């Protein structure tokens, strides 16, 4: 499933205040139960990276965010292998759990979708 599609569905829910007030609390509680914040991760650190979109996206990430992702991932592996969680003061807070990679991903998906569209354009006379 593409991030363009997740964004479509998600934004529709987020705007309509019927669904927005119904779902977001469910989603908030799902995210806390997931537990990745107790390992020091942001959600975007969790995205499977072994495909061309995510490699394009990670390539385009500014240096400082790149070094930070690298630390968070290494720190997560070390904590996982010790069968601990981090000290609570080290957990990622919800304010920090930003979609930092999302804009690069969406941009790359659009570029890719256009190429696929243009490689296959029909012509009418």
């Amino acid at each position: 499933q593409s991030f363009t599609s997740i964004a479509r569905i998600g934004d529709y829910i987020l705007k309509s205040p019927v669904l927005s007030k119904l779902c977001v609390p469910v989603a908030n509680q799902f995210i806390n139960l997931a537990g990745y914040k107790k390992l020091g991760l942001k959600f975007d650190d969790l995205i499977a990276e072994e495909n061309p979109i995510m490699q394009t996206a990670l390539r385009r990430l500014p240096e400082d965010e790149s070094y930070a992702r690298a630390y968070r991932i290494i720190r997560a592996h070390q904590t996982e292998l010790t069968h601990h969680l981090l000290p609570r003061n080290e957990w990622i807070k919800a304010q920090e759990d930003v979609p930092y990679l999302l804009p690069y991903i969406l941009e790359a998906e659009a570029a890719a979708k256009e190429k696929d569209e243009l490689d296959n354009i029909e012509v009418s006379k």
């Binding site: 243009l118 490689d119 354009i121 029909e122 012509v123």
Partner: protein
Amino acid sequence: AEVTQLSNGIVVATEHNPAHTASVGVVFGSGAANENPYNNGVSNLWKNIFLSKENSAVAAKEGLALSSNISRDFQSYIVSSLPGSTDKSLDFLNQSFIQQKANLLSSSNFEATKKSVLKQVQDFEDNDHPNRVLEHLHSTAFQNTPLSLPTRGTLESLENLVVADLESFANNHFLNSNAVVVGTGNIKHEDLVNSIESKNLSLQTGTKPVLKKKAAFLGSEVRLRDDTLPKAWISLAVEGEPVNSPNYFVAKLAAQIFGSYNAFEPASRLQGIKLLDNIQEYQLCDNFNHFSLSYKDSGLWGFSTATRNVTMIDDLIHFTLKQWNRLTISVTDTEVERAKSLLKLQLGQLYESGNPVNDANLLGAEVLIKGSKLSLGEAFKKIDAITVKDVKAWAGKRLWDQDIAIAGTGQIEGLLDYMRIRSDMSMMRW
């Protein structure tokens, strides 16, 4: 857009458009395809004395500029004037090709010119690897046949050439029945044809050239391995179309489908060419360009390429030939349509540059072969009428399971054997 050609005693062809300058010249219907293995380079030598410091100063006093071009089927000697001096160009043409065609070949002039085309043709072989390869492509593709002779001649036939060889050639080919006088620029047809019918005197009229034996494509290769060069340069072609082939334009369009490429130009990486998806992943080449070369008797359809990726040359060749396979079986409407538009654009940029010397060469070569020039608007009618069905029928005859001709130089250890290349001229089917 004009094409006025009429024959008096000589055949006069013009095409006028208010531009700036005017170009006058004679274009002979014999080139390097008319030479021997042993006097190969006589035409190039003729060109070079015609532009010698002696003859070139006599023209520059009068405010005239000199230009010449040796090709395979033809040969041209051209003077550009400033357009009211359209008469003083015809003076320089005749003062050279009747009077001075016994004064240009003076011992000190010939030896200093021969010494200069020797440094010239040597420099070519030493350094111009793309054109060197393309010239050897013609050499092997058309071996033991008129189209195999290189236009600049070979170093060995050149250094053994004497004044009498120039003479004998000039006396057999610079004839009236093997000539066309061409005027481009802005000058009228009746402005030139009257200045020509002014002076009579025919000079060797009634004399024909010498006949020969027809050109033929032979599937083959010449491999000029040189591991000290930093790249590999290769050209590969099938037998293409002669000028005045029904498929003259289908062939040219087919070449535009794959077009040309330059890895370092951002825009070039973005063209609507399917082959580019394959070759850009591992960067299989620095550049390629497809061509449909057409001559009187035959032609070559194929591509040339240059690369520093010397361990993946086989992928370059394989992906390129798999694309060409598609022309017989699966080329799409929108590929054909893209090619139409780009063929028009490039054919336009050729036929209507702001330079009359190019116009003269294009006019001259055309009228020498078919006795007329097809107008740019007439070509576009032919180009637009081409269907996917046409390209497929053409490719199925010229491309599919057909012999090829190969030439290369530089680091071509990775260019696989002939039969491997030749097997890729088709696909397995049920």
